[PDB]
């Protein structure tokens, strides 16, 4: 369990309502799954808690 990604990287993956990355306010608040538009690359790069681990429904990442 090394090489953990960073909340800064998750916020960078977070995008705006126009589909462009937030160039100045991406890191102001942590990424919210229910309200913030997100690049689909985030779910291939980083495994967030509450989501399948490597596209496996039997292994849901928990906090």
């Amino acid at each position: 369990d090394f090489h953990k990604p960073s909340q800064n990287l998750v916020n960078a993956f977070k995008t705006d309502s126009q589909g462009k990355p937030l160039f100045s306010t991406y890191d102001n608040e942590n990424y919210e799954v229910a309200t913030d538009n997100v690049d689909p690359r985030l779910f291939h790069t980083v495994g967030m808690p509450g989501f399948p681990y490597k596209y496996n429904e039997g292994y849901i990442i928990q906090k």
């Binding site: 990287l9 960078a12 589909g19 462009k20 799954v33 689909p40 690359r41 291939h44 790069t45």
Partner: protein
Amino acid sequence: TDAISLINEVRSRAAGSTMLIFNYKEDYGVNFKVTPYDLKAYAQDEAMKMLKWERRVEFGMES
């Protein structure tokens, strides 16, 4: 303009890359919204910033 076209190609690939996480919309309320940059005149610093962000969101966790 050619550089922006290449960045748009990468962004379009990212947008289409939803073959394994399509059900996330109805399963966890994940909003996917990424769009290619508009093809127009761009300043050098703006283009460099956009490219840096594209590199960050593309090669994250890839050392």
